[PDB]
Design a protein around this nucleic acid. Structure first.
Ligand SMILES: [Zn+2]
Lengths: 52, 148, 191, 171, 121, 67
RNA sequence: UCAUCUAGACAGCCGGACGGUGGCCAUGGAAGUCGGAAUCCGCUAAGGAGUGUGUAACAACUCACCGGCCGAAUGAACUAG
């Protein structure tokens, strides 16, 4: 156990992201398009897979 | 001191609520049955007031219940659990009486409005021999005085 | 679509003085002074009444009028950073191994050293950019405060200290250990 | 080319069963009379059952601009053929005359949609008599009160291949 | 459509200003719809309560400015969340009812305009 | 002290601005800008110097400091 | 092509987001939110017989709607260079 607030603060940077389906890039959670050129700024995004 | 409100089909969970008040389930059911002896065939809101010794049961007025009662209904066992769709006559006087019975309880906006709301409550009931319920309510000013 | 005139404003408080020759901005305030080269962005500045300065671009494209609001935000950040200052609070996060953070001096350069992050024998040293002061805060457990005038220097130093504590070859959703910035604000916040 | 506007009036050839046909009239932007009459017969073959062998042209007249020194705003309705289909567009141009407005229209369509003269159909062009009926921002930008703007970065082209001082782009 | 609903609002407001000499400006903060509904019912007989967008109201008053010129004084007070009470009763009785009803953890009367005269009250 | 900027003003184009025709049939006379067509061209008139009232591209004239 | 718009639009904060009614069937329960149908009034400035989270069912939170600040264009779907 870390602490509940400290787990929230660490998960803000480590777990509450989104993943581009084409190029696996770690993206902002409210993003609409990937920031990478190689996937062509696609809008195929998924949430980052949580535990539990 | 404590008031508990439940919707109960008449003639009859209750125990879970009763345990907090330390009241026998059977005793409560019997009291409720007597109260709904008037509103038994169909579900009606029941108010139980607890004096810390015993609970007194009364049936609070509800628009749907009053409307359902007004539509004449053959008694239904409910073992069948049929759709039991409700078909009703215009019963204009009964609805006005129901509006008066509400007596603008919970602040219905107007006496006429209370009746209009009562008409809307008959989503379930046909509420007219030949018309959609409350379709003509806007059209006809008749019975505004009766509701008051 | 070639917007022929777009224009932003910056408000100058009573304590500061801003000097703009060609595109070099100098802001002088109570906490000190800051400077900025902006010869890459191609705008024009105009003082109105010694507490208002308009910045404008004429016949600009979409990217160019985006850069106009960007440079307004940069010079306004400079003004509010020399008036109120900038303070970043970061918290230490560990499961088992406590992170031991001190300040050392190789050749007088004010290094921040990080020991025992997930129990390793490696010592992580991050340098400190000039103008940034670091205080290990009391009365809140495991909290470090970086303060300064430049938001760029303070936030970059905080980011370097955050990035130096990354976990390798493990599931980072479970191994949440690190040093993370929890608060960003001013030194004289709610002034 | 540099366009001119003509009215072209024509009709069918008169027969004994029907003398005096109905004398249709159209306004054509074209470089000259030959192209104007060709475009007239093109649009009448698109509209009515007639062709050049079966009809005749009774009049062609150049219509020059009534006020060539008034600055107008024109709304232009256009058909064009793209590479996949046919589309309608409405573009509005602030300019001093109708022929110059359709010249800048042809340049604008060729620049922004790669549409050629053979693909563009001019449905209509009309002066917008009132402001706030202007619907495009790129022309509504120039209708503001006391419009003024500078011209940064003056480049002066030189006649000599060598210049003896570093030039200045002040204007 | 939107304009039509709006036009009706302008008309009713004009009628209300004419109908009642006494006007109460009431500021509502954190007052629930239920709290508001109860107040309306209590005052249905003697008072009319009107709620509207301020931008909409100011234009209306300016539009109706030529008639009822004294109502112009009310415009500075209109700023901020406001409600209009039009009542036959002259002053205190209405005010007492509004403040007392539904105070929970709160209606306040910011200003009173009666007969061309404004009272901070 | 007081805030100091370099103003960097130059020769706005508006109505009443006097221009010098650089090249063309006039080619060296003065005109006055009557109205602004768009970003690149204006309607000018030079009635004392004999310049006819016309629309002209802004690359064919030079703006003078006179207004 | 649809909509909204100085009678205040879209973002961002803040407040309300209510009664008839736990509308009618059906379930051991399901009260806006397991489903089947209907989907109407009042008070309104405004609030769906409910957009989600949500509990055994509640309760609770949030929505789309209206309001204060902001003062001017913006949202959705589609087409092609
Ligand atoms: Zn990607």
């Amino acid at each position: 156990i870390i602490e509940p607030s400290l787990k929230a603060l660490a998960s803000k940077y480590n777990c509450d992201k989104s993943v581009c389906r084409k190029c696996y890039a770690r993206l902002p959670p409210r993003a609409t398009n990937c920031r990478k050129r190689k996937c062509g700024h696609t809008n195929q995004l998924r949430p980052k897979k949580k535990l539990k | 001191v404590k008031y508990l409100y439940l919707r109960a089909v008449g003639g009859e969970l209750a125990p879970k609520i009763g345990p907090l008040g330390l009241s026998p389930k059977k005793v409560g059911e019997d009291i409720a049955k007597a109260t709904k002896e008037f509103k038994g065939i169909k579900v009606t809101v029941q108010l139980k007031i607890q004096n810390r010794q015993a609970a007194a049961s009364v049936v609070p007025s509800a628009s749907s219940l009053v409307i359902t009662a007004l539509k004449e209904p053959p008694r239904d066992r409910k073992k069948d659990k049929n759709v039991k769709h409700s078909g009703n006559i215009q019963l204009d006087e009964i609805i006005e009486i129901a509006r008066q019975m509400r007596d603008k309880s919970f602040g219905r906006t107007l006496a006429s409005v209370t009746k209009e709301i009562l008409g809307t409550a008959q989503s379930v009931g046909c509420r007219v021999d030949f018309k959609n319920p409350h379709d003509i309510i806007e059209g006809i000013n008749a019975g505004e005085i009766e509701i008051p | 679509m070639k917007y022929i005139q777009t224009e932003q404003q910056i408000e100058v408080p009573e304590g500061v003085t801003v000097s703009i020759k060609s595109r070099i901005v100098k802001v002088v305030g109570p906490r000190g002074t800051l400077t900025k080269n902006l010869k890459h962005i191609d705008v024009t500045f105009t003082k109105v009444n010694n507490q208002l300065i308009k910045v404008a671009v004429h016949n600009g494209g979409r990217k160019h009028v985006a850069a106009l609001r960007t440079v307004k935000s940069l010079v306004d950040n400079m003004i509010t950073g020399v008036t109120k200052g900038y303070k970043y609070k970061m918290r230490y996060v560990y499961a088992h191994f406590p992170i031991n953070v001190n300040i050392v001096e190789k050749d007088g350069a004010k290094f921040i050293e990080v020991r025992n992050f997930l129990g390793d024998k490696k010592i992580r040293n991050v340098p400190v950019r000039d103008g940034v002061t670091i205080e290990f805060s009391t009365n809140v457990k495991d909290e470090i405060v970086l303060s300064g005038n430049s938001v760029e220097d303070v936030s970059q130093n905080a980011a370097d200290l955050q990035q130096i504590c990354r976990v390798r070859n493990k599931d980072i959703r479970k191994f949440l250990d690190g040093i993370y910035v929890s608060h960003k604000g001013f030194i004289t916040e709610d002034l | 080319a540099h366009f001119k506007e003509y009215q072209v009036i024509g009709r069918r050839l008169p027969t004994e069963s029907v003398p005096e046909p109905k004398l249709f009239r159209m306004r054509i932007f074209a470089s000259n009379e030959v192209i104007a009459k060709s475009r007239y017969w093109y649009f009448l073959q698109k509209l009515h059952k007639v062709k050049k062998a079966s009809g005749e042209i009774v009049s062609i007249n150049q219509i020059n601009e009534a006020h060539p020194t008034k600055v107008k705003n024109f709304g232009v309705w256009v058909r064009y053929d793209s590479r996949s289909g046919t589309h309608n567009m409405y573009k509005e141009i602030r300019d001093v005359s109708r022929v110059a407005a359709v010249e800048t229209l042809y340049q604008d369509m060729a620049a922004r949609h790669r549409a050629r003269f053979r693909s563009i159909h001019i449905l209509k062009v009309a002066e917008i008599e009132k402001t706030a009926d202007v619907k495009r921002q790129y022309v509504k930008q120039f209708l503001t009160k006391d419009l003024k703007f500078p011209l940064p970065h003056r480049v002066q082209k030189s006649t000599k291949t060598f210049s003896y001082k570093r030039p200045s782009t002040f204007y | 459509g939107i304009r039509e609903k709006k036009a009706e609002y302008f008309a009713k407001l004009r009628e209300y200003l004419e109908e009642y000499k006494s006007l109460f400006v009431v500021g509502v903060d954190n007052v629930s719809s239920q709290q508001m509904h109860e107040v309306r019912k209590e005052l249905r007989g003697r008072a009319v309560v009107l709620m509207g967008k301020n931008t909409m109201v100011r234009r209306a008053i300016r539009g109706f400015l030529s008639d009822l010129p004294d109502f112009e004084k009310l415009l500075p007070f209109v700023k901020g969340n406001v409600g209009f009470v039009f009542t036959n009763e002259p002053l205190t009785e209405i005010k007492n009812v509004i403040v007392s009803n539904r105070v929970a953890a709160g209606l306040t009367v910011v200003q009173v305009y009666d007969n061309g005269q404004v009272f901070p009250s | 002290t007081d805030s100091i900027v370099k103003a960097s003003n130059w020769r706005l184009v508006e109505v009443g601005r006097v221009v010098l025709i650089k090249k063309g049939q006039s080619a060296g006379k003065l005109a006055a800008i009557v109205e602004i067509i768009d970003q690149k061209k204006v309607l000018i008139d030079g009635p004392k110097a004999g310049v006819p009232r016309q629309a002209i591209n802004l690359g064919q004239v030079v703006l003078t400091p006179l207004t």
